[PDB]
C-alpha cells in the first residue's frame, strides 16, 4: 500500500475528495534449499543413538 | 538349472551384483528303432510252431 496521508479540511456540504490507496508490489522467488544424508543399513541398525 | 554358487563377500554400501539362475536344456530327439521279419505262406503252413 501507498504511505498513509491526512484527511482534508472540508467545508460543510462540500464534495469529499479522493485520495485513494494506490498500490504496488514486491516479487518473491523462493529458492530451494536442500540437504541430504546417507547411512548404511548396518550403520542405521548398529547405532546406540 | 545352473549349479548353486557361493554368495559374494561385499563392502558396506557397495552394489549387490547379479549372478542369476541361468538355464539350458538337453534336447531329446527320439530315434525310430525298427525290426522286420518276413515269412512265406508255405513256410507258415509247414512249420510245427
Ligand atoms: Mg463536483
Ligand atoms: Mg497522495
Ligand atoms: Mg556364476
Cell numbers found for residue A19: 485520495
B16: chain A residues, CB-CB within 8 Å: none
Instruction: Give the residue carrying C-alpha cell 538355464.
Output: B23
Distance CA A20, CA A14 (A): 18
Per-residue burial over A1-39, b = 16 or more CB atoms within 10 Å of its CB, e = otherwise: eeeeeeeeeeeeeeeeeeeeeeeeeeeeeeeeeeeeeee
Expressed in Å, this structure's resolution amounts to: 2.4
DSSP B8: P
* Nearest residue to B16 via CA among A2, A40, A44: A40
Cα distance between residue B6 and residue B16, in whole Å:
13
With residues binned 3-state (H G I as helix, E B as strand, rest as coil), the percentages for chain B, rounded to 5, are 10, 0, 90
Size of interface A-B (CB pairs under 8 A): 4
Q: How far apart are CA A22 and CA A25, in angstroms?
A: 11
Method by which this entry was solved: cryo-EM
Distance from CA of A48 to the nearest CA of B (A): 19
Q: Is there a contact between A1 and A21 (Cβ–Cβ < 8 Å)?
A: yes
Taking the mean position of all CA atoms in its chain, how far away is CA B45?
46
Mutant choice from B10, B11, B13 vs A, greatest count of A C-beta within 10 A: B13
Amino acid at each position: 500500500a501507498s504511505d498513509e496521508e491526512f484527511a482534508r479540511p472540508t467545508g460543510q456540504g462540500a464534495e469529499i475528495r479522493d485520495d485513494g490507496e494506490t498500490y504496488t508490489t514486491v516479487a518473491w522467488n523462493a529458492t530451494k534449499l536442500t540437504e541430504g544424508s546417507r547411512v548404511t543399513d548396518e550403520m542405521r541398525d548398529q547405532a546406540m543413538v
